[PDB]
Design a binder for this molecule. Sequence first.
Ligand SMILES: *[C@@H]1O[C@H](CO)[C@@H](O[C@@H]2O[C@H](CO)[C@@H](O[C@@H]3O[C@H](CO)[C@@H](O)[C@H](O)[C@@H]3O)[C@H](O)[C@H]2NC(C)=O)[C@H](O)[C@H]1NC(C)=O
Ligand SMILES: *[C@@H]1O[C@H](CO)[C@@H](O[C@@H]2O[C@H](CO)[C@@H](O[C@@H]3O[C@H](CO)[C@@H](O)[C@H](O)[C@@H]3O)[C@H](O)[C@H]2NC(C)=O)[C@H](O)[C@H]1NC(C)=O
Ligand SMILES: *[C@@H]1O[C@H](CO)[C@@H](O[C@@H]2O[C@H](CO)[C@@H](O[C@@H]3O[C@H](CO)[C@@H](O)[C@H](O)[C@@H]3O)[C@H](O)[C@H]2NC(C)=O)[C@H](O)[C@H]1NC(C)=O
Ligand SMILES: *[C@@H]1O[C@H](CO)[C@@H](O)[C@H](O)[C@H]1NC(C)=O
Ligand SMILES: *[C@@H]1O[C@H](CO)[C@@H](O)[C@H](O)[C@H]1NC(C)=O
Ligand SMILES: *[C@@H]1O[C@H](CO)[C@@H](O)[C@H](O)[C@H]1NC(C)=O
Lengths: 432, 432, 432
Amino acid sequence: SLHYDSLSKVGIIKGLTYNYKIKGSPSTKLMVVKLIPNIDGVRNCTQKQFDEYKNLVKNVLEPVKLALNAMLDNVKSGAIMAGVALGVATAATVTAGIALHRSNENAQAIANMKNAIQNTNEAVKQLQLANKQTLAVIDTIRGEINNNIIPVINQLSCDTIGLSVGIKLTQYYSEILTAFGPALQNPVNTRITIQAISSVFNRNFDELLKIMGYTSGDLYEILHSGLIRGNIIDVDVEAGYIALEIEFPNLTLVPNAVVQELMPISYNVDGDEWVTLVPRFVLTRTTLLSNIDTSRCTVTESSVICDNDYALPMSYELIGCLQGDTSKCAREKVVSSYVPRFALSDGLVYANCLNTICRCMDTDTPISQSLGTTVSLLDNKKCLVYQVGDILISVGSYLGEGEYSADNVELGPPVVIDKIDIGNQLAGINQT
Amino acid sequence: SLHYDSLSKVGIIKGLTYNYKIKGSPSTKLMVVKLIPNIDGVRNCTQKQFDEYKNLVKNVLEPVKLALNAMLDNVKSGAIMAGVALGVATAATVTAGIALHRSNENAQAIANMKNAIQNTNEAVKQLQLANKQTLAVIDTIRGEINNNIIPVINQLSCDTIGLSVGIKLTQYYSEILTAFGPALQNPVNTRITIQAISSVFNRNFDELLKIMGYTSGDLYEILHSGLIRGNIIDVDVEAGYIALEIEFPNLTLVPNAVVQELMPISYNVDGDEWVTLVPRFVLTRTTLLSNIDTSRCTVTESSVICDNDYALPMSYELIGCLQGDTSKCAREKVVSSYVPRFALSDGLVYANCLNTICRCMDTDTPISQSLGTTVSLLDNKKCLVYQVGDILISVGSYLGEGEYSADNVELGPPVVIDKIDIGNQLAGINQT
Amino acid sequence: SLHYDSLSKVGIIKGLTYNYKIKGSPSTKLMVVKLIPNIDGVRNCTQKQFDEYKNLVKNVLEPVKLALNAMLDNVKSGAIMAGVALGVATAATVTAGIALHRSNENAQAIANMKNAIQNTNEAVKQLQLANKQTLAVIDTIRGEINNNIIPVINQLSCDTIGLSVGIKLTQYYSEILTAFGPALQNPVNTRITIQAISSVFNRNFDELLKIMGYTSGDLYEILHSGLIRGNIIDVDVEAGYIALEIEFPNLTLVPNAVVQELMPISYNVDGDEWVTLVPRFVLTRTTLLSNIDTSRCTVTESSVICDNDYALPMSYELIGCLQGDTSKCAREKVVSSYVPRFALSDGLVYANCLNTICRCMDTDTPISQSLGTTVSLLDNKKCLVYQVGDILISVGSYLGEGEYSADNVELGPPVVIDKIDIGNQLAGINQT
Ligand SMILES: *[C@@H]1O[C@H](CO)[C@@H](O[C@@H]2O[C@H](CO)[C@@H](O[C@@H]3O[C@H](CO)[C@@H](O)[C@H](O)[C@@H]3O)[C@H](O)[C@H]2NC(C)=O)[C@H](O)[C@H]1NC(C)=O
Ligand SMILES: *[C@@H]1O[C@H](CO)[C@@H](O[C@@H]2O[C@H](CO)[C@@H](O[C@@H]3O[C@H](CO)[C@@H](O)[C@H](O)[C@@H]3O)[C@H](O)[C@H]2NC(C)=O)[C@H](O)[C@H]1NC(C)=O
Ligand SMILES: *[C@@H]1O[C@H](CO)[C@@H](O[C@@H]2O[C@H](CO)[C@@H](O[C@@H]3O[C@H](CO)[C@@H](O)[C@H](O)[C@@H]3O)[C@H](O)[C@H]2NC(C)=O)[C@H](O)[C@H]1NC(C)=O
Ligand SMILES: *[C@@H]1O[C@H](CO)[C@@H](O)[C@H](O)[C@H]1NC(C)=O
Ligand SMILES: *[C@@H]1O[C@H](CO)[C@@H](O)[C@H](O)[C@H]1NC(C)=O
Ligand SMILES: *[C@@H]1O[C@H](CO)[C@@H](O)[C@H](O)[C@H]1NC(C)=O
């Protein structure tokens, strides 16, 4: 439970409040990415280039089929994993293996549609499966032929058509190696985001989502957070395609979990300028404080959205600091020319008026701050419009038992923190 | 003030000297990015796809217009911010809000040109505003229609034209969501680099700069450093466009500020190989040393260019080390097979001749180093061409009071530094 | 030498074993990237735009030619570097300078083919040099003209052809500045990966490799690891091209070097849930342990592939921990809702049955764990199929002197580790 009045006196001002969300239950859609295109219309001119290409595709997929079959043979049917056959695995790996087995029904439904997939002549098509599920099938290369070669085909000789298609087949191959590289090497454990899958399809993830029945504008939270992901459930070596299953997860709101932002400003210590060291975000669960590493999460207007729960333990001293004992708040000296010197909270302005400019516009007078005063509070008790630095701002009233003051503030120890500095410091401590 | 003679004896060799620059005053140009294209020529074939598209654009921009109006209503007219209405903000946020108000004059000048923007039929066009400012207007989609559909339109049926344009409209939409995503969610505080804006325009930032009156080759320092940035000043929901203001800042040379590079090499300690731990870059201001985090700056041939002043405090022990007391310089043991074992400074070579190969080519003799000697200096007093490792090099003369030696060098404490290692070490220290 | 039985008792389970590889000897191929295209077929319509373009290219390359000549003049002929003329350099810089001199023979062979390069009319061409080496020559722009303008040229007026080509020339220029930016500023020391070079050629690295005589599928280890790189050996300012030399290195298997993965799980301490802090990867050389920073390496199915040898020293306490003294293993408390609670190793399952669900399926009974027990081992001595969490798994037999137990496990000190937390903690330690 954060204590805001004692924190503001060491320059820590209450910022925005966000709620906390984590990935919830799954929902899936099926997709096929074709590696071997339908080249009807250019077959006689491109015969040489196309046969070379097909052989390369086969060599890429054969090792993938072996990896997928190796895992399927370790699961029998809930489903039981053969621990001895698998030998070594993480809990996540074992779970992925079981999931692959469960998805085999969809893989078979897709395989039985092989002819419909092969005979598709449009870059994007939707097929129906025997189990009433839909399948999104894409062949980027066919699109490029339909748009760039066919409309002008009567102007091109076969040598030109052959060379032109060969370059297209080749650049597509490079896009596959880049987007699915890791997934082809480890098809059981690797997941691919929708924005990465779309890099094979000219980067058009909006089209892929539309086929699967979604509007991009309605998926902002899971799309932007990178939570729409797929995995390889099957491959067909001779047909030349990869079967993916794509997840569109729900989000779970975590009860009694609040993420609070803190806004540090500089403060005065007998003529010197200092800043207090606290984490930007603090996670509170009912009553307890913990650390939240938001560099691994997406922060939105109202929510912090994480894939999993990333709460980390907070040190004893930091909890003591945040709960109101300022003698435990480590501070660092400011040496650079800029640092935030004011902030707005609940309509009031907190500022270091010894390092920035504070004036009352109603009276055209300067605002003083004694050297023993750490921060100054600007409210509407005496003046409505203040000049703070290069801006003018109107403020509200102060709520409290009496006039705000920061005349006798207990400060924590000074620190210098860096990788090299800690090395030198800790060595000095143990050497002495 | 760095002491180079005592530092070279622990393997720290003086490297290149750079000056220091930070962002200076702004200069701006106006731009409009059209989301709804001019489709004259295909209107009858694309009617269905185009109407769906326009509705999606409207839904994307409406929330942006609300965010922009919400901030404008908090500023009245210098301009005064309503702190109570805003409630909670950083100093940066308040400044951004005031800036938005100031840019409203340009937003109105652009709005009054709405018909000229809508009736543009070229991918890139320059318009004149009533206030004698120019406006750069782009519509990437129109370019694609002019280049890929119109020249072959007599070969295409309407079903084909409809589908072909639909895919283009859709992929453009995806590029907008990726490039301006964060900016549409927070249009007041988010800034976009020119190389990111250009990702909507086929990645052609040179064309965008040319229209705005600049040559890319003359903007290397601010272009490469990521300092050319824009922000959203207005949107037009029904017209389907975003109005941006793009900054082309001047750079400020910081007086008496010098950034000095240090080049660590290994050295000998009684048969073991050690390296001293110092920061690669040290910032000096007149006489004082501080840390500079160059991972956040662009380092060029002669300058270190930072957006803001990022100087950080340096620890007491590290200052003592760098100023000549080598007993304060922490060292780490070398366990890997490679480490720099020599360096060139002021025409002279410093090397660890117990771990690498040092020979005099003039006499074809080996160069000895006693076990108590930390580093050896190779100069032209005795030999002109030296073999150092696998290279041959000519050297200059040594400037000093007498022969260089490193026979009695006081060394600092040994350390091992990592995240896990510090955890274990600090725990051991407090537990004991 | 890792001690696995005592480590499993604090939740550290043996994971996968990888071998260790580093970059070996070089092999090279030559390439030319043309900046000034062959525009035969559109010369009369594009005259204005083309002349402006050529002037811009000249201005970009002139400074590069000066940097290259400045270094060549410091090397005479093994080759000898002029240390005085160079002044200040790292060992790496001096080596790069010597290498540039050695590559000058190839630069001359390329220059003598200038007319063959200029008269090439296909996007990708292979030329023969007088020294029997091949040269890969690319001109992306020519490809775009051959594919998008010529087939429809009778439908386009000159104004249209002029504008259309101008946009293509301009976007190409932007791609060059992005891909070779750093290389043009520092042509002696900067290296470019093949996937970055290919970003000038529509991202088609498979085509570039094919011309140079390679199959992408056979280069997975060096291609994916980023070890296929080139450097600028020459430029021709008037002709408008950059000459590159591209390296295709062999890999060296490091003898007696093994990289071992560790898999941490949670464990019980009197009702609390804790996890032990160890590095994920440990490098062993014959008998010695060291740290390996794999974030700088590519991890493949069987190998860890690094550019250079990145072994780092390991602390005394961590070695003691890993070699069997568990009182030296620092631990951290779990506060988040998820943590791995089991793992599979050598067919056996290790689990924390106080925090997850453990049951025997053969008898349909729960598996107990006393509060004083740290971890539980699930083997086939009593039950074949276990339920662990939400999965079912079959297990093998335990190899040892008797029944596995973890009743009296000595634990190391508790820690909280973060950047801020260490700052506060170390300050408290020195202040007290
Ligand atoms: C652990 O605590 C000790 C004692 O405070 C630290 O040693 C002292 O550190 C200060 C800087 O914080 C040194 O500053 C100098 O003090 C003298 C006063 O004699 C003043 O004239 C100088 O201008 C400067 O301010 C002080 O010399 C130094 N004391 C000694 C005996 O060396 C120590 O650095 C702390 N350890 C860590 C890792 O922080
Ligand atoms: C703080 O200082 C103490 C005392 O120097 C450190 O304890 C000692 O650390 C060394 C390694 O630096 C251990 O190495 C061993 O020393 C014995 C000599 O008895 C030698 O035969 C071994 O081959 C090895 O070199 C030494 O055992 C250990 N001393 C004790 C009593 O355990 C301590 O590690 C330092 N703390 C930190 C965080 O650095
Ligand atoms: C270095 O060691 C000392 C001594 O263990 C640490 O001080 C103590 O730290 C613990 C937390 O680890 C504090 O926890 C509290 O203990 C009281 C028992 O009196 C209990 O009732 C509370 O609920 C809570 O568990 C303990 O108060 C504190 N001791 C004192 C005198 O303040 C110190 O934090 C360690 N330093 C570092 C950097 O770890
Ligand atoms: C290739 O096949 C198409 C479709 O039947 C035909 O129109 C074209 O003339 C054929 N080209 C050659 C060289 O046979
Ligand atoms: C569409 O409009 C254009 C321009 O007037 C015309 O040439 C074309 O024939 C029209 N197509 C149809 C299907 O009406
Ligand atoms: C440009 O040159 C080509 C090739 O000789 C010719 O066919 C075309 O008509 C010329 N165009 C003009 C405007 O002279």
